[PDB]
Amino acid sequence: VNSFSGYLKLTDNVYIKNADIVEEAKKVKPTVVVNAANVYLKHGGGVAGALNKATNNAMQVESDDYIATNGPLKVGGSCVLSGHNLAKHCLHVVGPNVNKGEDIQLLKSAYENFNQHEVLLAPLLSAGIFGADPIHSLRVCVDTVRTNVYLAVFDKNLYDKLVSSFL
Ligand SMILES: c1csc(C[C@H]2CCN(c3ncnc4[nH]ccc34)C2)n1
């Protein structure tokens, strides 16, 4: 028994809610919150810019040191950094950017990173400003992640659409 509240159960291991991931994180303080990162860990908008603002820019400061030491992530890759005031850890995961010509099959690789963590609070990936279809994306999540994932969907019309169209 964990502390997530109000989620709809989609499968044995996937749960969903119409919620802002930042508000969910502040309330639950989960072991792992997933960020929808880019390869440079430049947190400008969407999930990344909202989480980072909620950390008072501490996430960006930590991220810039990570990049200076290690170089960029791979599309489909991830790194574990601090969760600051939002979670114990933040798993920064890079989904493909279809508006950069990046292969959408890399979305499955991106979700595979979630399997290294028993429980996660996460958004939908190479959703929002990353330009992917949020049906196909939910489907890849369900068919790839085997650990327990709590999805926070910010847009109400996407959520109602995702739930009503979920096979
Ligand atoms: C509607 C318009 S763009 C879009 C797709 C993604 C971009 C923003 N995303 C979030 N997901 C969960 N919590 C969040 N909090 C802030 C942003 C956000 C999903 N949904």
mmCIF file of C-alpha atoms and ligand atoms in Angstrom:
data_model
loop_
_atom_site.group_PDB
_atom_site.id
_atom_site.type_symbol
_atom_site.label_atom_id
_atom_site.label_comp_id
_atom_site.label_asym_id
_atom_site.label_seq_id
_atom_site.Cartn_x
_atom_site.Cartn_y
_atom_site.Cartn_z
ATOM 1 C CA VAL A 1 0.000 0.000 0.000
ATOM 2 C CA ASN A 2 1.432 3.374 -1.178
ATOM 3 C CA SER A 3 0.202 6.999 -0.932
ATOM 4 C CA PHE A 4 -1.152 7.697 -4.460
ATOM 5 C CA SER A 5 -4.844 8.672 -4.410
ATOM 6 C CA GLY A 6 -7.619 8.946 -6.981
ATOM 7 C CA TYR A 7 -6.015 6.984 -9.844
ATOM 8 C CA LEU A 8 -7.900 4.881 -12.366
ATOM 9 C CA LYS A 9 -6.379 1.414 -12.769
ATOM 10 C CA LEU A 10 -5.639 0.604 -16.433
ATOM 11 C CA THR A 11 -3.731 -2.685 -16.001
ATOM 12 C CA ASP A 12 -2.062 -4.790 -13.325
ATOM 13 C CA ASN A 13 0.720 -2.169 -13.057
ATOM 14 C CA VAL A 14 -0.393 1.071 -14.797
ATOM 15 C CA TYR A 15 -2.546 3.750 -13.148
ATOM 16 C CA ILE A 16 -3.687 7.147 -14.516
ATOM 17 C CA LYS A 17 -5.146 10.426 -13.239
ATOM 18 C CA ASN A 18 -5.978 13.857 -14.660
ATOM 19 C CA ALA A 19 -3.395 15.775 -12.649
ATOM 20 C CA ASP A 20 -0.390 18.103 -12.813
ATOM 21 C CA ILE A 21 2.726 15.979 -12.079
ATOM 22 C CA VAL A 22 4.219 18.889 -10.046
ATOM 23 C CA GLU A 23 1.207 18.976 -7.701
ATOM 24 C CA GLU A 24 1.194 15.178 -7.432
ATOM 25 C CA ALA A 25 4.919 15.191 -6.520
ATOM 26 C CA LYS A 26 4.585 17.902 -3.839
ATOM 27 C CA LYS A 27 1.662 16.047 -2.244
ATOM 28 C CA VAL A 28 3.004 12.448 -2.456
ATOM 29 C CA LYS A 29 6.804 12.988 -2.340
ATOM 30 C CA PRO A 30 7.337 9.704 -4.259
ATOM 31 C CA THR A 31 10.597 7.797 -4.372
ATOM 32 C CA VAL A 32 10.886 8.561 -8.117
ATOM 33 C CA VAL A 33 9.378 11.310 -10.254
ATOM 34 C CA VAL A 34 10.023 11.081 -14.005
ATOM 35 C CA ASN A 35 11.001 14.188 -15.952
ATOM 36 C CA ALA A 36 10.297 14.499 -19.678
ATOM 37 C CA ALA A 37 13.844 15.645 -20.416
ATOM 38 C CA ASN A 38 15.823 16.567 -23.504
ATOM 39 C CA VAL A 39 19.368 15.307 -24.107
ATOM 40 C CA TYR A 40 20.894 18.553 -22.762
ATOM 41 C CA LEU A 41 18.802 18.540 -19.562
ATOM 42 C CA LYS A 42 17.687 22.086 -20.462
ATOM 43 C CA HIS A 43 14.410 22.355 -18.502
ATOM 44 C CA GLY A 44 12.580 25.146 -20.321
ATOM 45 C CA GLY A 45 8.889 24.223 -20.490
ATOM 46 C CA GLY A 46 6.255 21.524 -20.049
ATOM 47 C CA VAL A 47 7.016 18.886 -17.383
ATOM 48 C CA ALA A 48 10.720 19.814 -17.156
ATOM 49 C CA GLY A 49 10.257 23.583 -16.850
ATOM 50 C CA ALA A 50 7.429 23.192 -14.320
ATOM 51 C CA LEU A 51 9.340 20.677 -12.139
ATOM 52 C CA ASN A 52 12.468 22.828 -12.317
ATOM 53 C CA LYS A 53 10.577 26.007 -11.346
ATOM 54 C CA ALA A 54 9.086 24.079 -8.445
ATOM 55 C CA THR A 55 12.685 23.327 -7.307
ATOM 56 C CA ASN A 56 13.602 27.043 -7.497
ATOM 57 C CA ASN A 57 16.048 26.169 -10.349
ATOM 58 C CA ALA A 58 18.036 23.676 -8.203
ATOM 59 C CA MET A 59 17.200 20.936 -10.731
ATOM 60 C CA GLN A 60 18.773 23.015 -13.532
ATOM 61 C CA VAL A 61 21.911 23.764 -11.485
ATOM 62 C CA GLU A 62 22.396 20.059 -10.721
ATOM 63 C CA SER A 63 21.665 19.154 -14.355
ATOM 64 C CA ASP A 64 24.225 21.601 -15.747
ATOM 65 C CA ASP A 65 26.921 20.023 -13.569
ATOM 66 C CA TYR A 66 25.815 16.550 -14.759
ATOM 67 C CA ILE A 67 26.131 17.573 -18.431
ATOM 68 C CA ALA A 68 29.466 19.320 -17.894
ATOM 69 C CA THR A 69 30.826 16.036 -16.492
ATOM 70 C CA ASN A 70 29.070 13.427 -18.657
ATOM 71 C CA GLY A 71 27.890 15.095 -21.868
ATOM 72 C CA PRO A 72 24.383 14.774 -23.283
ATOM 73 C CA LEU A 73 22.038 11.865 -22.796
ATOM 74 C CA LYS A 74 20.964 9.630 -25.680
ATOM 75 C CA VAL A 75 17.479 9.908 -27.135
ATOM 76 C CA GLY A 76 15.754 6.975 -25.417
ATOM 77 C CA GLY A 77 18.139 7.222 -22.457
ATOM 78 C CA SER A 78 17.964 8.465 -18.889
ATOM 79 C CA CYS A 79 19.845 9.468 -15.779
ATOM 80 C CA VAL A 80 18.972 9.460 -12.072
ATOM 81 C CA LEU A 81 19.467 12.762 -10.256
ATOM 82 C CA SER A 82 18.058 14.290 -7.086
ATOM 83 C CA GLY A 83 14.317 14.822 -6.673
ATOM 84 C CA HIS A 84 15.030 17.979 -4.645
ATOM 85 C CA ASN A 85 11.843 19.057 -2.765
ATOM 86 C CA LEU A 86 9.578 16.951 -5.032
ATOM 87 C CA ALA A 87 10.745 13.316 -4.667
ATOM 88 C CA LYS A 88 13.691 11.332 -3.430
ATOM 89 C CA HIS A 89 14.983 10.946 -7.003
ATOM 90 C CA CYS A 90 14.210 12.343 -10.430
ATOM 91 C CA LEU A 91 14.557 9.958 -13.366
ATOM 92 C CA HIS A 92 15.251 12.221 -16.368
ATOM 93 C CA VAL A 93 14.050 10.294 -19.440
ATOM 94 C CA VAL A 94 14.480 11.456 -23.050
ATOM 95 C CA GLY A 95 11.628 10.450 -25.407
ATOM 96 C CA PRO A 96 12.022 11.014 -29.198
ATOM 97 C CA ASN A 97 11.185 14.462 -30.568
ATOM 98 C CA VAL A 98 9.101 13.886 -33.750
ATOM 99 C CA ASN A 99 9.540 17.591 -34.494
ATOM 100 C CA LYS A 100 13.336 16.978 -34.641
ATOM 101 C CA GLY A 101 12.897 13.943 -36.965
ATOM 102 C CA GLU A 102 13.765 11.527 -34.136
ATOM 103 C CA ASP A 103 12.616 7.895 -34.542
ATOM 104 C CA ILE A 104 9.359 7.197 -32.629
ATOM 105 C CA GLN A 105 10.466 3.585 -32.025
ATOM 106 C CA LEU A 106 12.807 5.210 -29.517
ATOM 107 C CA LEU A 107 9.735 5.796 -27.347
ATOM 108 C CA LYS A 108 9.805 2.122 -26.319
ATOM 109 C CA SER A 109 13.474 2.447 -25.342
ATOM 110 C CA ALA A 110 12.594 5.541 -23.286
ATOM 111 C CA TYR A 111 9.890 3.690 -21.332
ATOM 112 C CA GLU A 112 12.237 0.731 -20.700
ATOM 113 C CA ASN A 113 14.143 2.994 -18.280
ATOM 114 C CA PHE A 114 11.100 2.896 -15.973
ATOM 115 C CA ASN A 115 11.659 -0.847 -15.371
ATOM 116 C CA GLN A 116 14.734 -0.073 -13.243
ATOM 117 C CA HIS A 117 12.433 1.426 -10.549
ATOM 118 C CA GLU A 118 9.755 -0.429 -8.593
ATOM 119 C CA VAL A 119 7.325 2.532 -8.389
ATOM 120 C CA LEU A 120 7.269 5.825 -10.339
ATOM 121 C CA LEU A 121 5.184 8.967 -10.749
ATOM 122 C CA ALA A 122 5.433 9.881 -14.408
ATOM 123 C CA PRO A 123 3.948 11.951 -17.208
ATOM 124 C CA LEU A 124 3.135 10.666 -20.677
ATOM 125 C CA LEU A 125 6.287 10.880 -22.864
ATOM 126 C CA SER A 126 6.632 12.467 -26.369
ATOM 127 C CA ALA A 127 3.485 13.995 -25.223
ATOM 128 C CA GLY A 128 2.841 17.749 -25.025
ATOM 129 C CA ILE A 129 5.594 19.845 -26.624
ATOM 130 C CA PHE A 130 7.484 16.705 -27.772
ATOM 131 C CA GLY A 131 4.791 16.280 -30.454
ATOM 132 C CA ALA A 132 3.904 12.543 -30.264
ATOM 133 C CA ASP A 133 0.330 11.192 -30.167
ATOM 134 C CA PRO A 134 -0.496 10.706 -26.447
ATOM 135 C CA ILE A 135 -3.028 6.978 -27.756
ATOM 136 C CA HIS A 136 0.133 5.397 -29.214
ATOM 137 C CA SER A 137 2.250 6.713 -26.300
ATOM 138 C CA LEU A 138 -0.059 5.333 -23.591
ATOM 139 C CA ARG A 139 -0.115 2.046 -25.477
ATOM 140 C CA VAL A 140 3.702 1.838 -25.561
ATOM 141 C CA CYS A 141 3.824 2.571 -21.828
ATOM 142 C CA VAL A 142 1.362 -0.220 -21.006
ATOM 143 C CA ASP A 143 3.163 -2.677 -23.308
ATOM 144 C CA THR A 144 6.688 -1.778 -22.051
ATOM 145 C CA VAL A 145 6.637 -0.825 -18.368
ATOM 146 C CA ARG A 146 6.319 -3.758 -15.956
ATOM 147 C CA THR A 147 6.929 -1.847 -12.711
ATOM 148 C CA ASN A 148 4.214 0.195 -11.008
ATOM 149 C CA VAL A 149 3.671 3.488 -12.819
ATOM 150 C CA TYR A 150 1.311 6.291 -11.797
ATOM 151 C CA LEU A 151 0.639 8.517 -14.816
ATOM 152 C CA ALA A 152 -0.319 12.157 -14.262
ATOM 153 C CA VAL A 153 -2.036 13.536 -17.418
ATOM 154 C CA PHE A 154 -2.191 17.376 -17.301
ATOM 155 C CA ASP A 155 -4.720 17.978 -20.119
ATOM 156 C CA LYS A 156 -8.278 16.986 -19.190
ATOM 157 C CA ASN A 157 -9.401 16.412 -22.789
ATOM 158 C CA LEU A 158 -6.438 14.137 -23.437
ATOM 159 C CA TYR A 159 -7.187 12.218 -20.186
ATOM 160 C CA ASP A 160 -10.887 11.725 -20.869
ATOM 161 C CA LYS A 161 -9.902 10.765 -24.423
ATOM 162 C CA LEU A 162 -7.143 8.377 -23.234
ATOM 163 C CA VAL A 163 -9.425 6.581 -20.746
ATOM 164 C CA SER A 164 -12.409 6.321 -23.116
ATOM 165 C CA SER A 165 -10.211 4.996 -25.942
ATOM 166 C CA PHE A 166 -8.091 2.607 -23.820
ATOM 167 C CA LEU A 167 -8.250 -1.020 -25.000
HETATM 168 C C1 LIG B 1 -1.579 19.080 -22.775
HETATM 169 C C2 LIG B 1 -1.097 20.094 -23.568
HETATM 170 S S1 LIG B 1 0.475 19.574 -23.968
HETATM 171 C C3 LIG B 1 0.432 18.140 -23.109
HETATM 172 C C4 LIG B 1 1.596 17.156 -23.133
HETATM 173 C C5 LIG B 1 2.684 17.169 -22.026
HETATM 174 C C6 LIG B 1 3.321 18.516 -21.896
HETATM 175 C C7 LIG B 1 2.933 18.954 -20.483
HETATM 176 N N1 LIG B 1 2.640 17.694 -19.726
HETATM 177 C C8 LIG B 1 2.430 17.581 -18.319
HETATM 178 N N2 LIG B 1 2.056 16.420 -17.846
HETATM 179 C C9 LIG B 1 1.859 16.302 -16.557
HETATM 180 N N3 LIG B 1 1.993 17.224 -15.623
HETATM 181 C C10 LIG B 1 2.401 18.379 -16.128
HETATM 182 N N4 LIG B 1 2.643 19.503 -15.516
HETATM 183 C C11 LIG B 1 3.032 20.465 -16.285
HETATM 184 C C12 LIG B 1 3.051 19.990 -17.563
HETATM 185 C C13 LIG B 1 2.637 18.653 -17.488
HETATM 186 C C14 LIG B 1 2.176 16.691 -20.684
HETATM 187 N N5 LIG B 1 -0.762 18.029 -22.547
#
